[PDB]
């Protein structure tokens, strides 16, 4: 009994256990045995095997449901029947998941983005619910480990807990869970597809590949000619000098004030932050990318749906950078731009730049500088996030 074979079957069992209760009920048994073969046998002829398990082992059937040990036992009983099941779940002759299963072909045209379609979100909603055993709409570390049992490695670093919404204890909430998949689909779609394969998405939803979960948006250029978009996820690059408050902006989207932010650790620090934002009654995803001050602004880190140029009102040299980067990359750009006067809770000093932030915005047809602070008693104001998303949806309005 090769250890590798048992590992595959255990994962197959875990995937086939769709309600995640520990056993395979007859509904799940019919489904598995249908997709692997052809026709679910007589409901009584099903126990013509379900009692066979009962009279060899005493832990193979629990509450009229086939257990893992029973599942593994039935594998032993057969030994081609096994390889049919294995190949149906995407394994090859070396008991590894095939590249065709994990990495399906999904090529995205330039200036297009990737989102999860409606049914894909539903799968993740179901997935979340099956692993939320205490029913608190949040995934504890133990519940997360349970989820990752069908993963060859841990798919999420502990920095994810500051990229999306979490509860009091810092556990990924229901919306934070969806936000993380939304973010992953956007940035690294082939990683998302690989993870969907691990969850057995294509198998359970009975589709051609994992790529069937991904919606590929149209060219951004067309969105600007038509002057309207159908995208639900927009990316905003957050640019500003060192310690100007960029990270504070990202965590403010997650509803965390400066007090709450101070408890973030070693490698907790994320440079992305995503959450739902409502624009005129329309629910959209806002995707913030923290651009740490570097020697260069590449084409890579200046491409977005809206730019957030942040400066520090307590720093007299901070705004000069915003003006510099703007003239350099976004002055004659189709990309909307918003200037944010961060740390507004601090005393406002004079910016050493020749022109004032107000006059600068007035001169270049920008909105007036938006005052912002994350140092508040409760959750910070989400005003700038609503404005950023609005500008991303409706550029020149
Ligand atoms: N690891 C890493 N550090 C970087 C990178 N780019 C810039 N930094 C450093 O990050 C610091 C500036 O970050 P800052 O602008 O304050 O934004 P923050 O990352 O949110 O703190 C400087 O010490 C940079 O050298 C990068 O790609 N990787
Ligand atoms: N008073 C005040 N301090 C802030 C605010 N936001 C950030 N800070 C402090 O400013 C420093 C830099 O903030 P951070 O978000 O790390 O900036 P970044 O390095 O540019 O991303 C930290 O010491 C923060 O505690 C704010 O709204 N008010
Ligand atoms: Ca079950
Ligand atoms: Ca839970
Ligand atoms: Mg910094």
Curated annotation (Swiss-Prot):
Protein's UniProt keywords contain Protease: no
Predominant location: mitochondrion
Keyword flag Acetylation: yes
GO cellular component, one term: mitochondrion
A biological process term (GO) from this entry: mitochondrion organization
Keyword annotations of the record: Acetylation, Calcium, GTP-binding, Hydrolase, Isopeptide bond, Membrane, Metal-binding, Mitochondrion, Mitochondrion outer membrane, Nucleotide-binding, Repeat, Transmembrane, Transmembrane helix, Ubl conjugation
Domain EF-hand: 4-39, 119-154
Residues that, per the record, bind Ca(2+) 2: 132, 134, 136, 138, 143
Membrane topology annotation: Single-pass type IV membrane protein
Family: Belongs to the mitochondrial Rho GTPase family.
Name of this protein: Mitochondrial Rho GTPase 1
Record organism: Homo sapiens (Human)
Full-sequence portion shown in this chain: 181 to 582 of 618
């Amino acid at each position: 009994m090769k250890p590798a074979c048992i590992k595959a079957l255990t994962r197959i069992f875990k995937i086939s256990d769709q309600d995640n209760d520990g056993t395979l009920n007859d509904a799940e048994l019919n489904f598995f045995q249908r997709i692997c073969f052809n026709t679910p046998l007589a409901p009584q002829a099903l126990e013509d095997v379900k009692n066979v398990v009962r009279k060899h082992i005493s832990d193979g059937v629990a509450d009229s449901g086939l257990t893992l040990k029973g599942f593994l036992f039935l594998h032993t009983l057969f030994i081609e029947t096994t390889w049919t099941v294995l190949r149906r779940f995407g394994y090859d002759d070396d008991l590894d998941l095939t590249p065709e299963y994990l990495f399906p072909l999904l090529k995205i045209p330039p200036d297009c983005t990737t989102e999860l379609n409606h049914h894909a979100y539903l799968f993740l909603q179901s997935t979340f619910d099956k692993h939320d055993l205490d029913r608190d709409c949040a995934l504890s570390p133990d519940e997360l480990k349970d989820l990752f049992k069908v993963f060859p490695y841990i798919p999420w670093g502990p920095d994810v807990n500051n990229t999306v919404c979490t509860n009091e204890r810092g556990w990924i909430t229901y919306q934070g869970f969806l936000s993380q998949w939304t973010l992953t689909t956007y940035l690294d779609v082939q990683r998302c597809l690989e993870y969907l394969g691990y969850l057995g998405y294509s198998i359970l939803t009975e589709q051609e590949s994992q790529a069937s979960a991904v919606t590929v948006t149209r060219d951004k250029k067309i969105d600007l000619q038509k002057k309207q978009t159908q995208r639900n996820v927009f990316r905003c690059n957050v640019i500003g000098v060192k310690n100007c408050g960029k990270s504070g902006v990202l965590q403010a989207l997650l509803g965390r004030n400066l007090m709450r932010q101070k408890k973030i650790r070693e490698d907790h620090k994320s440079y992305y932050a995503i959450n739902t934002v409502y624009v005129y009654g329309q629910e959209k995803y806002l995707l913030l990318h923290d651009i740490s001050e570097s020697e260069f602004l590449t084409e890579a880190e200046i491409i977005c749906d809206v730019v957030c140029l942040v400066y520090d009102v307590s720093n007299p040299k901070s705004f000069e950078y915003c003006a510099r980067i703007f003239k350099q990359h976004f002055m004659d750009s189709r990309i909307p731009c918003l200037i944010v006067a961060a740390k507004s809770d601090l005393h406002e000093v004079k910016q050493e730049y020749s022109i004032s932030p107000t006059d600068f915005c007035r001169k270049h047809k920008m909105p007036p500088p938006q005052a912002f602070t994350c140092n508040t008693a409760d959750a910070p104001s989400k005003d700038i996030f609503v404005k950023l998303t609005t500008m991303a949806m409706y550029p020149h309005v």
